[PDB]
C-alpha cells in the first residue's frame, strides 16, 4: 500500500501548470532542506494546517 508521513507545517502554496493547488510540506522529524511540493489531494486531515498557513500569508 501507499505510505503516509506526519506533517509538521504547511510553509507555502502554488498553482501547477494544470491549475491544481500544491502545498510545500514540512515533514515532522525532518527540517526545511527536505520540504516537498505535494498535490492538495496528497494531504490527509491537514485542513487546520492549511488554515494556519493562510492566516500567516
Amino acid at each position: 500500500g501507499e505510505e503516509l508521513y506526519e506533517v509538521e507545517r504547511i510553509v507555502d502554496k502554488r498553482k501547477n501548470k494544470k491549475g491544481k493547488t500544491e502545498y510545500l510540506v514540512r515533514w515532522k522529524g525532518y527540517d526545511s532542506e527536505d520540504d516537498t511540493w505535494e498535490p492538495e489531494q496528497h494531504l490527509v486531515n491537514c485542513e487546520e494546517y492549511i488554515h494556519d498557513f493562510n492566516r500567516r500569508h
Binding site: 501507499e2 505510505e3 503516509l4 508521513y5 506526519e6 506533517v7 510540506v25 515533514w27 516537498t36 505535494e38 496528497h42 494531504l43 490527509v44 486531515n45 491537514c46
Partner: peptide, 5 residues
C-alpha cells in the same frame, strides 16, 4: 498526514 510523492 500526507502521501509523500
Amino acid at each position: 498526514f500526507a502521501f509523500k510523492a
